[PDB]
Amino acid sequence: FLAKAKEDFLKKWENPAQNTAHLDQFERIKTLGTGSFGRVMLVKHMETGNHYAMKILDKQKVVKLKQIEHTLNEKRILQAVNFPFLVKLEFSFKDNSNLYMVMEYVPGGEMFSHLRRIGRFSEPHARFYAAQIVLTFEYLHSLDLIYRDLKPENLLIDQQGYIQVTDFGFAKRVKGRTWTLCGTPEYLAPEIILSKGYNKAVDWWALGVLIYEMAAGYPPFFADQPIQIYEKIVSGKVRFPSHFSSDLKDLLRNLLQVDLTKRFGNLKNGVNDIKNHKWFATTDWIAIYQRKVEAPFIPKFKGPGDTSNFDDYEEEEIRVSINEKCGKEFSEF
């Protein structure tokens, strides 16, 4: 599959799909999330009656925060990839004021919501999710893509209880090294913090943070201010809840490894250092891929368009100016 996958991806990467629907083809139902330049809304595609999640970004706000290239990355990558645990982009378009991405609606809510409410996940429930990320990072990294924003907030749970990765704002196709200070503080690898130049290994570090956080219910480095988190990441040592298994600790010690010649996922054996670790001894990797494993948790679902696995957000009307904004900047979107 990984052979056929790069071929398919490069074709879409090189000739991206553009302008494949219009705003007026969608009824706007409810906000499912926000960010600094817009929001994701539940919508219904009037023609098919299907529900989707629509991300709306304000072009002027994106320019203000100098995120043009990152938003062009997000859509170009998302329209080109294809994997069971990546949210599927269905349509993309833009108008005078906004950018739109219409994706699968993933009705189970964010892992974030379930994780905070429950406290923490059991090692088997955490492992189930971690396996899916391992495979998604194997796929992405095979295409020279770094994800750079792994966290429970970006992992949506579908009706089958499997993960769908969303929010590709910091994803970037890079061979070799890149330098942008970006990500979420709790999940940043030390090399990002230290402005060294860094590569796909930052995703493997982040996987360590996510596993820790799933299993403990809090992340390995927290504090009230980002800068204090950074200091812990760089100069501090990881300590584990007494309930962590010896195998979980050994895995996390190898993922939350400052030294790049020693970090799992960055060795010559690559992803298999992780796949063949004892913590994953119960994981049938092909069965996870094919979604044949019974999920440990299945969200409550009461028909489509139901949003009770999501928080409520203040609604505001989508405004579209009569004058085109930032046309040049977003030409290729």
């Binding site: 960010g35 600094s36 925060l65 100098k66 995120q67 974030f112 905070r116 406290g119 924003d149 966290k151 907030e153 704002g169 910091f170 942008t180 200070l181 970006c182 990500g183 979420t184 503080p185 709790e186 403990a216 219910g217 809090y218 927290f222 504090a223 009230d224 980002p226 988190i229 809840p241």
Partner: peptide, 20 residues
């Protein structure tokens, strides 16, 4: 407890990305 320290911290909600 570490749990108590987390719950009392300002980082238990949805975390934003950073850009410089």
């Amino acid at each position: 407890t570490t749990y108590a320290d987390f719950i009392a911290s300002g980082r238990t909600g949805r975390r934003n990305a950073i850009h410089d």
